[PDB]
Amino acid sequence: SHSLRYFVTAVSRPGFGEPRYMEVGYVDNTEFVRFDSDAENPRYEPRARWIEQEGPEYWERETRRAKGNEQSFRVDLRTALRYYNQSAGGSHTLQWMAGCDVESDGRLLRGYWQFAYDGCDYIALNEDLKTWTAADMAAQITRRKWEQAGAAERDRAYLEGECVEWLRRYLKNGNATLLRTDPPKAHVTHHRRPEGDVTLRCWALGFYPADITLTWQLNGEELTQEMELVETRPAGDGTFQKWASVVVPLGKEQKYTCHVEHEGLPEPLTLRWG
C-alpha cells in the first residue's frame, strides 16, 4: 500500500504574534509540499523535484486552500478556549492529519481525518468514514455541529475521491524516487569495553525505503533480547541509517553474525567482525 498524508499544525503564541500555521504533505514517508505562515510571502511550495512539474494553477489553488484552512484553524483555537474555559494568555496547539492509504490495487484501504488539541485526541472520523469519535465533552459539541452540517459525507468524498486520485497521479509523476529501492551498505565496527568484553555494532547506511530489519545472531539464535537498536533515522539526502549493537566476550567475535534484510538487496547480507 501507499499513502498521501497532510499534517497540519496551528500554534498560538499570545503576546509574540499571530498563531503560526503550517502544512506539510507526504507521499509514503517522503515530504513533497509545505506551507508556512511565517514565510515572507506564505505560499504552497514544492519540497521534491517531481512535484515541480505541476503548473501554476496547482500552486495557486493549494495556496488558497491553505490560507482558508489557516483562518479556519484560528477560529478553532478561539472556540477551544471557550469550550475549555481557558484564558487568552496561554499558548495552545491544534493538529490535524488527513489523507488516504491505497492498496497496490489503487482502491482505498483507510481514510484519515483526525484532530488533536494540545497533543491530545480531540475528534476523529471513524474508519467507516460516516461517524465521529469525540474524546471529551468539548469535542462532543463539535461532533454535534458537524453531524448537523453533514461534514462526514463531504470528507468521505475527499478521502475516497480526490485523495485516491491524486495519490495515483503523484505515484506516477514521482515514480523515479518514490518507488525506487536503494540497498543498505553495511559494515561492523569493534570496540573494547573496560569490563573486558567488546561491543560489535552493525551499520546499515544509504538505504531506501525506510523499512529494514537488522538482527545479530549467535549460532542461528536471534539474540533479540540483548541487542541495542537505534530508530531508523534520515541521512538528510532521502536515504536512511540504522545500527544494532551487541556485547560479546573478547575472544568470540567470529561467532556472531549481523543480518540485513531489505527490498533493495538481491540477497540478505551476512556480516561478521572481520
Binding site: 477560529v75 459539541i141 463539535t142
Partner: peptide
C-alpha cells in the same frame, strides 16, 4: 492535493 477544513469547532 490537501483537504479543506470548512467546518469549525
Amino acid at each position: 492535493t490537501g483537504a479543506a477544513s470548512f467546518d469549525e469547532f
